[PDB]
Amino acid sequence: HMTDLLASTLEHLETLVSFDTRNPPRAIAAEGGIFDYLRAQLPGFQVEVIDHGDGAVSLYAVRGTPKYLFNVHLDTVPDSPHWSADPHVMRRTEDRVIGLGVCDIKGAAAALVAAANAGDGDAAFLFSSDEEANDPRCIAAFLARGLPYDAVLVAEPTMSEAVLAHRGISSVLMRFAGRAGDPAASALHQAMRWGGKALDHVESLAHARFGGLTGLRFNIGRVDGGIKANMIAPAAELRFGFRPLPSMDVDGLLATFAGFADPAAAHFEETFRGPSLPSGDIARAEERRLAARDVADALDLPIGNAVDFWTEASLFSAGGYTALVYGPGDIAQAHTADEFVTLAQLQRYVESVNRIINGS
Amino acid sequence: HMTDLLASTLEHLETLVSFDTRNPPRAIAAEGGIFDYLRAQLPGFQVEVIDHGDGAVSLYAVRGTPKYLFNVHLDTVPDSPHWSADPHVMRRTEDRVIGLGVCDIKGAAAALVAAANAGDGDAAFLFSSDEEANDPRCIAAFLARGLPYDAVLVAEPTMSEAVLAHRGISSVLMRFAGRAGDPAASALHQAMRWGGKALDHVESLAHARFGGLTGLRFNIGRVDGGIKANMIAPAAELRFGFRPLPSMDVDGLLATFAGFADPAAAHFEETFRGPSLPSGDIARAEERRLAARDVADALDLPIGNAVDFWTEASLFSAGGYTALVYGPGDIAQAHTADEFVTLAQLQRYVESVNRIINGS
Numbered sequence: 154h155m156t157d158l159l160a161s162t163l164e165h166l167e168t169l170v171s172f173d174t175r176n177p178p179r180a181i182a183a184e185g186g187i188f189d190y191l192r193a194q195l196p197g198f199q200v201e202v203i204d205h206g207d208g209a210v211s212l213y214a215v216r217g218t219p220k221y222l223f224n225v226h227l228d229t230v231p232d233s234p235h236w237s238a239d240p241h242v243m244r245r246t247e248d249r250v251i252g253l254g255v256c257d258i259k260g261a262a263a264a265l266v267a268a269a270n271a272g273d274g275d276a277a278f279l280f281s282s283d284e285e286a287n288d289p290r291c292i293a294a295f296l297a298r299g300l301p302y303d304a305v306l307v308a309e310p311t312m313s314e315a316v317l318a319h320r321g322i323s324s325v326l327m328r329f330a331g332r333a334g335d336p337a338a339s340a341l342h343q344a345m346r347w348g349g350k351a352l353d354h355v356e357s358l359a360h361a362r363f364g365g366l367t368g369l370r371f372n373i374g375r376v377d378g379g380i381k382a383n384m385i386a387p388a389a390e391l392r393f394g395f396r397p398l399p400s401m402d403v404d405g406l407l408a409t410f411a412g413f414a415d416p417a418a419a420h421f422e423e424t425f426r427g428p429s430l431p432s433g434d435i436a437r438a439e440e441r442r443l444a445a446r447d448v449a450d451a452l453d454l455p456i457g458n459a460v461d462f463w464t465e466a467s468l469f470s471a472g473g474y475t476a477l478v479y480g481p482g483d484i485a486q487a488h489t490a491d492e493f494v495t496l497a498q499l500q501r502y503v504e505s506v507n508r509i510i511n512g513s
Numbered sequence: 514h515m516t517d518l519l520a521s522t523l524e525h526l527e528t529l530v531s532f533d534t535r536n537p538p539r540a541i542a543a544e545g546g547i548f549d550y551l552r553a554q555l556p557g558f559q560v561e562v563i564d565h566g567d568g569a570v571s572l573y574a575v576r577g578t579p580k581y582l583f584n585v586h587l588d589t590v591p592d593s594p595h596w597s598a599d600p601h602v603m604r605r606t607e608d609r610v611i612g613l614g615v616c617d618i619k620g621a622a623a624a625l626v627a628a629a630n631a632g633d634g635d636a637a638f639l640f641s642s643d644e645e646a647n648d649p650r651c652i653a654a655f656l657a658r659g660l661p662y663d664a665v666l667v668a669e670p671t672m673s674e675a676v677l678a679h680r681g682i683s684s685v686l687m688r689f690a691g692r693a694g695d696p697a698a699s700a701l702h703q704a705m706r707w708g709g710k711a712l713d714h715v716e717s718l719a720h721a722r723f724g725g726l727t728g729l730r731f732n733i734g735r736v737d738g739g740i741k742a743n744m745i746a747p748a749a750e751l752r753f754g755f756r757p758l759p760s761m762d763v764d765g766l767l768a769t770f771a772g773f774a775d776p777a778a779a780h781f782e783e784t785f786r787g788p789s790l791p792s793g794d795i796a797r798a799e800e801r802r803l804a805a806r807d808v809a810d811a812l813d814l815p816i817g818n819a820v821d822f823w824t825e826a827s828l829f830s831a832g833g834y835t836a837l838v839y840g841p842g843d844i845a846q847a848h849t850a851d852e853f854v855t856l857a858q859l860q861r862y863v864e865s866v867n868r869i870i871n872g873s
């Protein structure tokens with residue numbers, strides 16, 4: 154099954170995918186490349202490209218006097234391991250397309266561009282390029298401009314359903330150092346004791362709940378230290394993260410985790426922190442969530458369940474905007490070899506945003 | 514202070530050190546090199562060189578009808594990191610010599626060769642080349658010959674004191690694999706829980722004692738797994754070891770450690786196991802220890818305290834020989850950058866073995 158709108162989405166997507174926007178290394182320039190392309194695909198829009206430096210670039214486009222803002226990040230995660238073909242050459246099958254970023258989240262960008270070219274309805278787009286890694290600058294810079302919008306829809310794969318809430322996120326780098334001057338002699342033994350305490354604590358929060366989400370997702374994703382079995386390891390590196398539910402005290406959680414290290418870790422560095430969606434006290438979280446639900450209803454979008462993954466909708470929400478996450482595709486395909494998004498998902502999403510933008 | 518005996522020891526040591534006998538890679542041949550050298554430095558000895566393959570070579574030399582056997586391994590640990598000069602070029606200061614293996618344990622070999630060349634007293638030497646790493650073959654092969662000896666003195670740095678007992682040793686390689694089908698999803702979380710149980714168990718054995726040695730020395734020397742902080746790690750490698758006191762049930766300990774993994778570790782491989790010295794039931798251990806003490810007294814050697822490190826004296830003892838560890842130098846310098854042994858230690862040791870071999 155094909156439609157002109159879907160055909161156009163696929164054409165734009167093929168081009169978008171061909172642009173290397175992997176982050177890291179986030180070698181994205183304001184001039185040339187993907188942004189020069191988008192500049193020529195937004196008829197009737199007032200367009201501005203802002204270079205925030207080091208690959209953090211934004212394209213803000215406005216046509217008419219839209220009440221809603223669509224934000225879509227253009228960077229993708231790195232490719233491989235195991236891609237069966239060039240990640241930057243979109244492939245197509247009977248029911249889906251394959252390519253780096255087709256699911257997260259260039260598919261949404263392609264659909265929005267298709268809609269922009271299928272009618273001249275009011276619309277506002279904010280294409281950023283730094284969502285996938287550290288040192289983000291785009292959204293923070295945009296928020297500082299204080300531009301009014303009734304709501305902001307941030308694109309991420311949500312199976313084309315409006316998501317109103319999601320967990321926050323924290324990533325931490327820890328380094329343990331042996332104390333020759335002793336049960337703390339080994340950095341690995343220290344890491345082991347720390348880990349036990351951390352996991353036990355996570356278990357104690359298992360009953361916390363929010364919109365179907367339960368407990369605290371916690372993960373020790375990397376441990377590296379030592380040389381040989383019987384040689385005492387003087388150093389050990391450990392990286393962990395957790396995804397708080399809205400209203401959880403993240404500052405307190407981080408300090409609690411840090412305090413489990415005895416002696417103190419030689420290094421304890423939170424490399425990234427993202428707020429939950431919505432964020433704040435439970436009362437604020439529910440009020441904000443309901444405001445987002447009302448917007449989804451107004452735009453006739455099916456409401457999906459809260460998700461565990463993080464998105465920048467959290468930033469807009471913390472900034473005072475009613476915000477929701479909405480995009481084609483399944484998060485299951487995000488950051489996977491031969492990443493794909495179904496034509497069905499692409500069609501549903503493009504028809505929806507075209508309706509919002511150009512529909513009667 | 515200098516003596517002809519010490520001067521000769523130093524000359525032989527300089528040569529011995531110059532031969533590369535690092536293990537790994539244990540690139541030691543029966544022909545040429547260090548063994549061809551020893552063949553020409555043992556006057557009056559019946560000499561045999563046996564190639565056991567892959568760098569495991571032995572030189573068995575006998576002069577007269579000696580009652581004691583001196584075993585000295587000729588391989589050394591690998592060099593660096595941080596050596597300030599060529600590890601194979603022995604350096605000398607006012608009170609010590611520096612070089613790979615001068616302390617562990619070529620210094621003893623040099624002294625024994627010096628003694629062999631300072632008199633024609635009865636003596637038996639067994640120079641092996643595979644003590645420092647896995648896949649040993651020399652001692653096992655020698656034991657299979659069933660050659661009688663009242664006692665076997667195995668060289669290791671013992672500050673020139675006769676050591677009568679030491680811990681056994683075990684090294685294990687573990688691999689944890691995440692169970693997607695779940696609290697066991699992460700291999701690192703599994704390793705963390707395993708480690709906690711293992712350390713707790715070690716603590717429960719803290720009161721075990723033997724000749725001044727207390728508890729079970731246990732060590733998780735290497736942990737490596739995962740990629741990023743928030744990505745679930747499907748695999749994790751862990752290497753640990755422990756050093757049992759004589760009479761401890763090592764088989765039981767190993768199974769206990771293995772059982773702490775829930776689910777079972779994807780891989781649990783004991784890469785090396787060495788018996789304690791002496792070994793067996795407590796009664797046997799004490800009887801054997803006393804027999805070794807009597808030999809030390811007979812040879813007028815000062816008795817040192819039991820040690821934590823492992824030696825092949827354990828193998829001879831398990832084979833039915835009264836055995837003790839005896840050698841110049843401090844274990845503190847073993848396997849260190851700019852490894853050294855004092856002239857004082859060299860002098861004391863060479864004078865002692867010369868006395869045993871050639872003395873009235």
Ligand SMILES: [Co+2]
Nearest residue numbers: 257258284309
């Ligand atoms: Co995304």
Ligand SMILES: [Co+2]
Nearest residue numbers: 617618644669
């Ligand atoms: Co040694």
